[PDB]
């Protein structure tokens, strides 16, 4: 009946928001990542790290506001508030990108805390921990994109910036510089996200249209009882329907719901792997056979060669303003351009 | 016992391994025509002058393409929105050069897939089901209409319809972003929420049911053998699912009614995808993503760039390079 | 010396065969372009 | 096209080895019931 046990007791009380041991890591770190993002997006600039305005204070709106990455000259500095860069000065710390590392690192530990919460509550309730396991996919994406990708690069500067339009820019960077759409690990991710959305829609619709008539009313929601033993829709009719429409159907509810976990989790896991490749500029940029043919045969043209011209435009047109530390000066005559435009 | 009535009974029979139905009567021929033409063109079509400038793009495997780079190439910009059936060409050689197969395939597919959706209504009526699964499929179907039909109509050319290829698809999404700033368009943002959200809730629901499976098996056998097809009792504990999930967040953000939960599962991605289909369909009439280029300036009037301006520099790089030989005049108005 | 009592039968049903073959054929169809390069 | 010559053997084995494994496990499953 020692103190440790007493604290266990209190941490694990049934209350409106459950706390747990995992709450000790989760709640401070989640609140701080979130508050860092709302503090930076409301008040903090990117002028000294990026040459950009990035807060409401400066005149940006919800789409263009961001907490931007540190300057490329910071390398992979932790940018601790008390570290040699900011030297304890809150203001300079803000101006040098300190909130980017604050959010990313506190976010990381929050994510850990959230997955520990899923483990903690699942043990207390007596259920299998498959919701935690599933959550490994979000974690994999976050670390691969926000931590591993820039750690392979020259600096944190090239990580995603925490904002709507900043992420849109991150998408387009990856097209032009990594040709990320060509990457089979991204493709497997696309199939998992779209495959998952499909499953989500097709499963919800099937249940809602194979319902048993368990009440007299035209709103069919009233006629379910959470403790009823009986299935609330017909697997049998569902299976015959899809078998006749599509050719195959699920017959095993368990496999069906496991598949629904499996598809989107795996897709996200595959894309993480590919972004790890891109940390090293290890791209699926080209198909060698196409380039050798197209170098020799100026009549040979595919959608693959067409898209590289686009990547080439992107790089040359966005690079000077997107990488201000490189002092790229591209005079007019060197910019790639088609006729007239 | 009459001939027509026996035919009608076979068309609508609920005993065919695959349901035919009256919608099936149109679907089957048209999907077969589109499938067969697609397969043959993907492998063996000669190059096609997509942009009407006598610069044929090679899309098939025998002309030096792989699975990733191959496509059926959209028809010639010289055809614009004119109908180009085989019998309007002087010959198959002409029809191939100008991209005839694309038109055959997309029209038959759109028709056949429209009838696919009707077929979903029909069998549900033959089986005594509620009828709205077809409404779920209208969201993907609308999306296909938008990139193969609506966007050409508004732009005046199937040459700007989406290519039937993996890299063709990428060429289409890159040019769309430069001409419409689709990323800054809210309906596309709703699609992403519909698709991210849909994958999230797929994972959530599959993980939540899987977590609360009732023990029916031993560790040496698949848990899946704990469910028998057609069994009357449910195979997980939804209250245990609710009690975990309600505590992970809070009680009232969790579903205790499976009907509401499953209808939420249906509606979220369907509505997101309607919007993103609407997005393509309305950018077809050039009502484009938000434009905040140079929206922040300083006291003197210097431009203070935002991330929107950086996006614009990428869009500009796409604009000036796409279809590098096709434009003679300074504005790409379609 | 007894026969080893830990031995266990292995199963793969027909549906798992179809699912698994599809996986492998679609994986092959996706990566082969990159293997030929 | 000047394509990687080992692509073929790689693709063939990538298909054959995992498929043969699944077939082996299916047929011996069926010989039980």
């Amino acid at each position: 009946r020692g103190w440790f046990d007493i604290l266990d007791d209190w941490l694990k009380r049934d209350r409106f928001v459950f706390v747990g041991w995992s709450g000790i890591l989760l709640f401070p770190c989640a609140y701080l990542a979130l508050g860092g993002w709302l503090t930076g997006t409301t008040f903090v600039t990117s002028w000294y790290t990026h040459g950009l305005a990035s807060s409401y204070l400066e005149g940006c709106n919800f789409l263009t506001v961001a907490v931007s990455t540190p300057a490329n000259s910071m390398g992979h500095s932790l940018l601790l508030l008390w570290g040699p860069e900011a030297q304890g000065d809150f203001t300079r710390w803000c101006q040098l990108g300190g909130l980017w590392t604050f959010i990313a690192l506190h976010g990381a530990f929050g994510l850990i805390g959230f997955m520990l919460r899923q483990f903690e509550i699942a043990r207390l309730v007596g259920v299998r921990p498959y919701n935690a396991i599933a959550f490994s996919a979000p974690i994999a994406v976050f670390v691969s994109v926000f931590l591993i990708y820039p750690l392979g690069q020259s600096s944190w500067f090239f990580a995603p910036s925490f904002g709507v339009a900043a992420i849109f820019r991150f998408l387009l960077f990856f097209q032009g510089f990594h040709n990320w759409t060509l990457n089979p690990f991204h493709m497997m991710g696309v199939a998992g996200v779209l495959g998952g959305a499909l499953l989500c829609a097709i499963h919800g619709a099937t249940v809602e249209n194979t319902l048993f008539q368990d009440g007299e009313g035209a709103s069919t929601f009233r006629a379910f009882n959470p403790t009823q033993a009986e299935e609330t829709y017909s697997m049998v009719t569902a299976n015959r329907f899809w078998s006749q429409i599509f050719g195959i159907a699920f017959s095993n509810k368990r496999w069906l719901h496991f598949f629904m976990l499996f598809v989107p989790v795996t897709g996200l896991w595959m894309s993480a792997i590919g972004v790890v490749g891109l940390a090293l500029n290890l791209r699926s940029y080209d198909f060698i056979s196409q380039e050798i043919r197209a170098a020799e045969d100026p009549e040979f043209e595919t959608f693959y060669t067409k898209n590289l011209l686009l990547n080439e435009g992107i790089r040359a047109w966005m690079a000077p303003q997107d990488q201000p530390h490189e002092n790229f000066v591209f005079p007019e005559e060197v910019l790639p351009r088609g006729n007239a435009l | 016992a009459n001939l027509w009535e026996r035919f009608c009974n076979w068309v609508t029979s609920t005993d065919n391994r695959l349901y035919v139905g009256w919608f099936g009567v149109i679907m089957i021929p048209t999907l077969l025509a589109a499938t067969i033409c697609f397969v043959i063109a993907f492998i063996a079509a000669p190059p096609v002058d997509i942009d009407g400038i006598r610069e044929p793009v090679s899309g098939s495997l025998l002309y030096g393409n792989n699975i990733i780079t191959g496509a059926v190439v959209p028809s010639s910009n010289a055809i614009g929105l004119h109908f180009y059936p085989i019998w309007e060409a002087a010959s198959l050689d002409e029809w191939l050069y100008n991209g005839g197969p694309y038109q055959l395939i997309i029209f038959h597919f759109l028709l056949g897939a429209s009838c696919y959706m009707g077929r979903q209504w029909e069998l549900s009526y033959r089986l005594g089901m509620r009828p709205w699964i077809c409404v779920a499929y209208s969201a993907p179907l609308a999306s296909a209409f938008a990139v193969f039909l609506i966007y050409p109509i508004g732009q005046g050319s199937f040459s700007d319809g989406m290519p039937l290829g993996i890299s063709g698809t990428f060429n289409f999404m890159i040019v769309f972003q430069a001409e419409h700033n689709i990323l800054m368009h809210p309906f596309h943002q709703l699609g992403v929420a519909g698709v991210f959200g849909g994958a999230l809730f797929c994972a959530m629901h599959g993980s939540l049911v899987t977590s609360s499976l009732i023990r029916e098996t031993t560790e040496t056998e698949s848990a899946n053998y704990g469910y028998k097809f057609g069994q009357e009792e449910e195979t997980y504990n939804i209250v245990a699912a609710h009690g975990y999930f309600g505590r992970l967040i809070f009680q009232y953000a969790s579903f205790n009614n499976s009907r509401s939960l499953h209808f939420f599962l249906a509606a979220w991605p369907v509505v997101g995808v309607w919007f993103t289909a609407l997005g393509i369909s309305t950018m077809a009439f050039n009502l484009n993503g938000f434009n905040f280029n140079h929206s922040v300036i300083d006291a003197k009037g210097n431009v203070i760039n935002t991330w929107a301006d950086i996006i614009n520099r990428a869009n500009l790089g796409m604009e000036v390079m796409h279809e590098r030989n096709a434009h003679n005049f300074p504005l790409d108005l379609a | 010396m007894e026969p080893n009592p830990n031995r266990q039968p292995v199963e793969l049903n027909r549906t798992s065969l179809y699912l698994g073959l599809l996986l492998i054929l679609v994986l092959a169809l996706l990566f082969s372009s990159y293997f030929f390069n | 096209m000047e394509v990687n010559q080992l692509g073929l053997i790689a693709t063939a084995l990538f298909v054959l080895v995992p498929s043969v494994f699944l077939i082996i496990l299916y047929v011996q499953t069926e010989s039980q019931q």
Partner: peptide
């Protein structure tokens, strides 16, 4: 040879479809 390979794999998938549908394990009640 690359063309033969791609079409072969696609052809196998199409045959697999045939068996998955018409030679499925038939679902059986309770």
């Amino acid at each position: 040879m690359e063309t033969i390979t791609y079409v072969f794999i696609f052809a196998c998938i199409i045959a697999l479809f045939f068996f998955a549908i018409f030679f499925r394990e038939p679902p059986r009640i309770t």
